[PDB]
């Protein structure tokens, strides 16, 4: 169960995806931070 938020968990689980899926929820913090948070994912 791979699955990211840029803010909350109770957001961070709303959208998910699955172990096979990687997704990185990102905003305007910077095109790194989006990055990094499909990293979490994907690797998850």
Do not use: D, E, L
């Not at 803010?7 to 990094?36: D, I, K, L, M």
């Amino acid at each position: 169960w791979g699955c990211v938020c840029s803010g909350s968990t109770a957001v961070a689980n709303s959208h998910n995806a699955g172990p096979a899926y990687c997704v990185g929820y990102c905003g305007n913090n910077g095109v790194v931070t989006r990055n990094a948070n499909a990293n979490v994912a994907k690797t998850a």
